[model samples]
Target: MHHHHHHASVTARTPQNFSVPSPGPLNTPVNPSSVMSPAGSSQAEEQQYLDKLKQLSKYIEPLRRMINKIDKNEDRKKDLSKMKSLLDILTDPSKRCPLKTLQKCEIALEKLKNDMAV
Candidate 1:
């Protein structure tokens, strides 16, 4: 007599066990030879990440320009401290910038520091 054994993979019992109709823009026909795992990041999530990266980049440049002013011995004394605070908040990855828009209001108090000489 012969005996047989079978095992189920991690995806066997999950919703992605087999290809199903993924709602929204995610629903599209894939190539016959190509395979896409649902575990991969979704388009919306990737877009959100990109959006935040762009904001960080935009804000960092202005902050850098202000810092460059100090290199030139420019006297932006009071302004420097204010700009530092704003820069810290923007670069703070852990701090959730509580604004829905890219233009944050908390930094409004330091608007002049927004474009200060480095």
Candidate 2:
């Protein structure tokens, strides 16, 4: 045990990951199921979770990309980044932020984007 390396545990999330390459970028958010076992949070729910995260990703990622290009004020930048930071947990697959919190970020992004667009 003293000479053990740092390769870590194996991933059983997608045991058949060797064959399919069609859903390429889809795996980035999944990153191998850290909690893919036990009861509760069925596969449908899990997919829904990722779907919402995917939705949040679309909103937040786009806003983050254009936040600087669309503005010059440090205050606005801080505002945007601060909100984005909160959603960092949601964006992260390991964190698994609750639906309410994720929805809040979704709403906030909608408002923020509307403001910026107008």
Candidate 3:
């Protein structure tokens, strides 16, 4: 699936107050058009998007660190369940979230599951 963002822009131009003779001996009416976009924007925009995703991932980091440090049986179990919920939220595709976000969460969940087995 694909998504698109549309933006609107307006331009102003000055009209000659007094008409002047055409520069060329052969007079021809001139019509011109121009289009604009944020050219050279992809690389920087992609980096910015990834940075925001990182900030979001950090929201779950404290839970991960606390979970890793726990030694109590009941606490560890609770953390394990919460971590699974975190994975579920990240992997849900109905939201059309970016693949980078899903990959990051999947990698973390893989590591957490490995630790749980130890």
Candidate 4:
């Protein structure tokens, strides 16, 4: 027996400042916008998003390795977990991760790297 089931329709809200402008040269700066997503974007547009995020991940991975090398202190581990969390958010397409999020991840990596210099 098959029963008809109607599921509640849910709409996903894209964050404010969500605009991704046309993808230009890799060396060019990206302009963030309040527009939703690449459903309306071209292949190069999506590549621009992926490229920038990949660059951000370059900052994240080394910090992760450094954290792993050190003794697992409470504070150190806390920072390490935070980096992983940020990276996870950035990598998740469903999250529609924001530009500010990428900025924060880069900053976190920079700070963590500096702290390790001692």
Global lDDT of each candidate: 0.54, 0.62, 0.53, 0.63
TM-score of every model versus the real structure: 0.37, 0.48, 0.29, 0.47
Best of the two (2, 4) by lDDT: 4
Which candidate number would show the highest lDDT if scored against the true structure? 4
Candidate 1 colliding pairs: 66-118, 67-118, 68-118, 69-118, 70-118
Which stretches of model 2 miss by more than 4 angstroms? 1-47, 74-78
Regions more than 4 Å wrong, model 3 = 1-72, 81-84, 91-93
Give the higher-TM-score candidate: 1 or 2: 2
Ranking by lDDT: 4, 2, 1, 3
Name the 10 consecutive residues with the lowest summed lDDT in model 4.
20-29
Best by TM-score: 2
Q: Write the per-residue lDDT of candidate 3 for residues 1-118, one digit (tens) a residue.
A: 6657457545575546225433322223354542222354355555555555555455456555545554356646666665656645653445355856656665766676686677
lDDT of 3 at 7: 72
Candidate 2, residues 1-118, lDDT tens digits: the string is 5767778887665634236444423223446665554554466776787678666766656655555564566657656564556446556656556788777887776677676765
| Residue pairs with backbone overlap in model 2 | none
Q: lDDT per residue, candidate 1, 34-105, as tens digits?
A: 445466556766566545646554665576566556445556566665446556666657535544333552
Candidate 2 lDDT score at position 59: 62
Model 3 TM-score is 0.29
